[PDB]
Amino acid sequence: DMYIERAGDITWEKDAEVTGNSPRLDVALDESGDFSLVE
Amino acid sequence: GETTDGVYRVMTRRLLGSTQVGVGVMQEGVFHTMWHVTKGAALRSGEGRLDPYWGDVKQDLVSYCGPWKLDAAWDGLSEVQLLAVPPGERAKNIQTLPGIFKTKDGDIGAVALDYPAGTSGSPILDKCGRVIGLYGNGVVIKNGSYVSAITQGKRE
Numbered sequence: 744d745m746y747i748e749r750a751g752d753i754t755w756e757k758d759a760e761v762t763g764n765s766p767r768l769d770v771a772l773d774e775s776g777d778f779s780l781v782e
Numbered sequence: 783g784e785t786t787d788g789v790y791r792v793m794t795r796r797l798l799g800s801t802q803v804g805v806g807v808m809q810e811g812v813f814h815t816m817w818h819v820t821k822g823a824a825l826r827s828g829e830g831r832l833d834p835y836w837g838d839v840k841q842d843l844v845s846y847c848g849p850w851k852l853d854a855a856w857d858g859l860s861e862v863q864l865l866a867v868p869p870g871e872r873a874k875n876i877q878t879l880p881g882i883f884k885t886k887d888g889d890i891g892a893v894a895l896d897y898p899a900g901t902s903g904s905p906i907l908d909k910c911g912r913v914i915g916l917y918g919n920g921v922v923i924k925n926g927s928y929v930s931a932i933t934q935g936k937r938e
């Protein structure tokens with residue numbers, strides 16, 4: 744049996760940690776909802 | 783159960799201790815998560831039960847109690863913030879310019895942030911605080927990291 748616990752409000756926050764790149768990726772989506780890389 | 787809007791942890795006791803299997807969004811009385819988190823099972827909130835309403839294994843989404851409510855979209859230009867809720871750690875906002883998944887059926891926003899699998903379902907927000915989609919459905923890249931679509935459902 745799975746249960747839920749509240750973890751916070753949903754808010755834009757000024758001065759959040761800014762990280763991560765922006766990769767342009769060729770991908771395919773299968774019937775099981777798994778994405779894969781197409782080279 | 784608790785029906786206040788905001789972000790929630792999804793937990794099981796079916797393993798050692800209490801284990802966080804993912805995250806989701808309560809909006810307008812509807813619980814929103816990814817399908818691979820719950821596999822469409824019912825959820826407890828206190829002594830309240832949340833029954834599945836809508837789901838789609840291909841979209842990897844599921845709503846509880848009502849129809850998908852979340853209708854905002856990445857503008858294709860502006861940064862966004864992952865409101866990451868990692869297992870055993872406080873909700874933390876992480877700001878990032880999404881990349882692109884290129885698919886035969888169209889381009890989707892993608893976020894390149896590496897978090898444990900139990901973060902699956904954390905919301906991706908725009909500058910006005912709207913949920914533009916969910917984190918945790920994507921691909922392991924040349925580098926070994928995980929890059930997630932911005933996964934959004936349709937509102938009827």
Ligand SMILES: CNc1ccc(-c2ccccc2C(=O)Nc2cnn(C)c2)cn1
Nearest residue numbers: 818897898899901902917918919920928
């Ligand atoms: C060791 N390999 C991996 C692979 C994926 C992840 C991961 C990372 C962040 C957010 C979600 C996931 C994740 O597991 N997503 C997912 C989608 N469908 N399924 C069945 C699982 C971690 N490590």
